[PDB]
Amino acid sequence: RNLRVLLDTAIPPSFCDTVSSVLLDDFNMVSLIRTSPADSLATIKQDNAEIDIAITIDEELKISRFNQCVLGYTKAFVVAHPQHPLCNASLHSIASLANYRQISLGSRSGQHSNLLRPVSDKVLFVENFDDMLRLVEAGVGWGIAPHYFVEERLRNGTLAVLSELYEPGGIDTKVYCYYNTALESERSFLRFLESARQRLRELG
Amino acid sequence: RNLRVLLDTAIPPSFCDTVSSVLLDDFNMVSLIRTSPADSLATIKQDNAEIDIAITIDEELKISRFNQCVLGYTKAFVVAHPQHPLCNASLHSIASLANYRQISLGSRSGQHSNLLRPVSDKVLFVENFDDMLRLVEAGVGWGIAPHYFVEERLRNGTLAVLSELYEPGGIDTKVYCYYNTALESERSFLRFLESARQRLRELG
Numbered sequence A, B: 001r002n003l004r005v006l007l008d009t010a011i012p013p014s015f016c017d018t019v020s021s022v023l024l025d026d027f028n029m030v031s032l033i034r035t036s037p038a039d040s041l042a043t044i045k046q047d048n049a050e051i052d053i054a055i056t057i058d059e060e061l062k063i064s065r066f067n068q069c070v071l072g073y074t075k076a077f078v079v080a081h082p083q084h085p086l087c088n089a090s091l092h093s094i095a096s097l098a099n100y101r102q103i104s105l106g107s108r109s110g111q112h113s114n115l116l117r118p119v120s121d122k123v124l125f126v127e128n129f130d131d132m133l134r135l136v137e138a139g140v141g142w143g144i145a146p147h148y149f150v151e152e153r154l155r156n157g158t159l160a161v162l163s164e165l166y167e168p169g170g171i172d173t174k175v176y177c178y179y180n181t182a183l184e185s186e187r188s189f190l191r192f193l194e195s196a197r198q199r200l201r202e203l204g
Ligand SMILES: CCCCCCCc1cc(=O)c2ccccc2[nH]1
Pocket: A010, A057, A076, A078, A104, A115, A116, A117, A119, A144, A145, A146, A163, A166, A171, A173
């Protein structure tokens, strides 16, 4: 009995180490699959992907063949080159973010949800977060990326934060867990959440 | 110069005491207005309401004449009569919540956002949270209400919680602050957030 799991690129590696660790105690065949958060909800809807669990930040409660629950929380920031014109982080900057270029991720389906849809009118899409930060480091525009994708570049001064005025301490983001309805009965999955969650709580 | 503020019924009174307290230090005319969270985003869009600040949990970033920011967090639960059939709180209960009657709030505009839209197909609307809990205490159905609306009834056993399986510790919910673009310049508003937030942080 194989178990195909989905972890988007927005899941920090700490979360990743916790998921894989537990599943191996009861399940003996686990397939980890990485996807862009814009393509997470899309790939699980595919009838042929046969995805059994998915751990993404994207929001969509009414999904067929799937339930929803929360695993933990994680921070994300609005980054930009330290010399970007909007570097002032002013209240007018938070509002005029929709007037400058944003570097959001591209959806293989061309569709974005309310959470991940680009907020700005001038947008430039990319494939993964790696390609985003490169363009952001070059002052091309601003974007929203996880904390672990940016923790290093900030201490090096390579990037600057602008969301503090919007949400201090970073944009707390929910990490949902979509699980096939067939697993709601098997107690092996029950033990997974109680363990995966209790460990993520120890992080903070 | 009058200042019309909007606090939905989902804002716990602790949040309410903090908002009113600060505004009186710099502003000398403040009008507090309460609304149903389903009618919060709707009343600010009214050209005649002339609302200057709004503090609600409802999500809608692309609003004309308004910006957005986060003030704090608050918990909400899925409540039900302790003898409700779904009292088991099982994984099948969290999924079958869409099959039983829900007691959600009614929108004066008839429209609900992604956050507040009733998740279940069998729905029964009400005007405020007071009318919800009454019906919930009578085993009519389940609903989602703030923590301060339910903190008393739980210790009395009058209600039971079901969201622990979905999100332990309660459904952490963001409390946004919509402020008119005209206030982004006045430093009086700047001092409000830095004060309103720093105090809400002391709560937890
Ligand atoms: C000031 C910005 C508005 C608030 C952000 C909107 C929600 C949101 C949009 C994102 O692309 C994103 C990307 C990675 C992690 C979380 C994210 N969350």
